[PDB]
Design a protein around this ligand. Structure first.
Ligand SMILES: Nc1ncnc2c1ncn2[C@@H]1O[C@H](CO)[C@@H](OP(=O)(O)OC[C@@H]2O[C@H](n3cnc4c(N)ncnc43)[C@H]3OP(=O)(O)O[C@H]32)[C@H]1O
Ligand SMILES: Nc1ncnc2c1ncn2[C@@H]1O[C@H](CO)[C@@H](OP(=O)(O)OC[C@@H]2O[C@H](n3cnc4c(N)ncnc43)[C@H]3OP(=O)(O)O[C@H]32)[C@H]1O
Lengths: 268, 269
């Protein structure tokens, strides 16, 4: 499993499944008209979870019937697999879901259809998902997770590939950004009407040395202090939390991020 | 300009317009069923351009009727304007279209509706737009363009804001990347079901200094190389600088990119 593909999950499966006669009528029954595009904290979202198993089994049938094209995730993923001739025994897939039932719905179906096709997969959820003042914290968190993963698998000697096709815009923007930073092998994308997948350009991108110099000596100073003696050799730590490089959590607010610490170590 | 907003334009307007009874039937008449989602080099795309004025006038009516919500671009843009209370007088808005008739159709309608609302706007077209082996060159080109605007207005002392909402995924990803690099004030995004726009987090990001130091030394020798002096200070031009930093390279000569030349100047040299 030395070929890992990371992807977001969206609601493509939901929206494409309203083509199926059986699905449109069963969904229309539960009153789930626009179930692919609803507010993250919508009443219709609870409808999806109490019927979750009912809907999960319906979409498996639609996904087996339609194949690749039923969903953005599977369409782009399997286009890329055949393009790059990846073996299923040497293959691993990471699906990130959001904290919404339509996203976990699509995630669960895609995970099942992959393991049925003979492809190992793993689900995951950025729990920090709603709009009001949490959405920015959510993409912050998903960025922190993906970038750590990419370094971890890259240390083992995995070939990491990034499916930037599916999920919300910011979700996909950060998945390519983290890939560029953590040195992923490829970032691919496939538009609905493309024949096969296309590879995005990769600029050589790093954390700005202005902040990076203070991160070097952050670890050396026992990391976390007060105000003056925390800025004791020139560490603006509130500035560091604003640029999402350090975490506060409590009173003092001195917690070097787990990816940041690991990325400094790759000056060898 | 005193608060500049750059955006991509997609086929949101086209897709949302098939709600209108007049639009659905007139579009269905021209056989433009899925006109929001067609291959960039599709026959249906020519259908759009010979009826362009007919369709341009139809969508103006729909856009005046619906307002903001008729398109992603206008919905996210005007949500941001009211959020950040930009006085209409000082606004300038930069819409990039792709090289497809549906996109320029959307663009033209949006340009007209903005100038009618009292907002200065300007169209643009990334001409290198098709799938086969041109799409990566096209987003390379859009990235080259949108980098420049950010540097220009930021040097003048005007603020700059990026609408990462609209257009294809790569188009929006590189619009935010450029913003992050060239030091734009904000990058905002609005999901179709959000109340108003949300501001994306900002890691402090630049081009890695290991490549940056090789790019400074390329500049000093007037660009366009092949061999012998191809690794004179440690510059692999068809290998490491084939990561989109050098143009052509494998055919004719190996020249450096017009954005990277201007970016070495903007980072103090
Ligand atoms: N008036 C407007 N008309 C049309 N679009 C508008 C308008 N105002 C704003 N927009 C937004 O503008 C972007 C242009 O398309 C859209 O944001 P985008 O990131 O593209 O979201 C679209 C899809 O939402 C899906 N997905 C919705 N929930 C979730 C969710 N909770 N987890 C993951 N994916 C989700 C994503 O997965 P997928 O493969 O099907 O594509 C995306 C629109 O939501
Ligand atoms: N089996 C599949 N089912 C569903 N979606 C699939 C599938 N395989 C791939 N996808 C893609 O995955 C994303 C959603 O799952 C989509 O790609 P995305 O880049 O998000 O397309 C989004 C919209 O394309 C539109 N726009 C189509 N033309 C053009 C064009 N020529 N200039 C600009 N924008 C264009 C834009 O309108 P806007 O404001 O609402 O947002 C974009 C789909 O094309």
């Amino acid at each position: 499993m030395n070929k890992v593909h990371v992807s977001a999950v969206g609601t493509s499966l939901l929206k494409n499944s309203l083509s199926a006669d059986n699905v449109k009528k069963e969904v229309e029954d539960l009153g789930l008209k626009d179930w692919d595009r609803l507010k993250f904290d919508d009443d219709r979202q609870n409808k999806i979870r109490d019927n979750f198993t009912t809907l999960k089994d319906l979409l498996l049938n639609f996904l087996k019937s339609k194949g690749k094209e039923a969903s953005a995730e599977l369409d782009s993923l399997l286009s890329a697999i055949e393009k790059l001739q990846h073996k299923k025994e040497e293959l691993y897939v990471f699906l990130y879901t959001t904290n919404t039932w339509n996203s976990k719905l699509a995630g669960e179906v895609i995970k099942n259809y992959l393991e049925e096709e003979g492809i190992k997969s793993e689900l995951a959820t950025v729990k920090s998902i709603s709009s009001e003042e949490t959405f920015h914290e959510g993409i912050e968190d998903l960025f922190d997770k993906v970038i750590y993963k990419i370094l971890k698998f890259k240390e083992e000697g995995k070939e990491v590939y990034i499916n930037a096709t599916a999920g919300l815009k910011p979700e996909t923007t950060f998945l390519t950004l983290a890939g560029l930073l953590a040195g992923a092998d490829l970032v691919y994308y496939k538009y609905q009407e493309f024949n096969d997948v296309v590879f995005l350009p990769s600029p050589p991108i790093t954390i700005s040395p202005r902040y990076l110099e203070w991160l070097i000596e952050f670890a050396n100073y026992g990391y976390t202090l007060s105000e003056k003696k925390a800025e004791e050799l020139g560490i603006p730590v509130r500035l560091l939390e604003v640029r999402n490089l350090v975490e506060r959590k409590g009173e003092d607010a001195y917690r070097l991020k787990d990816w940041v610490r690991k990325m400094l170590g790759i000056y060898l």
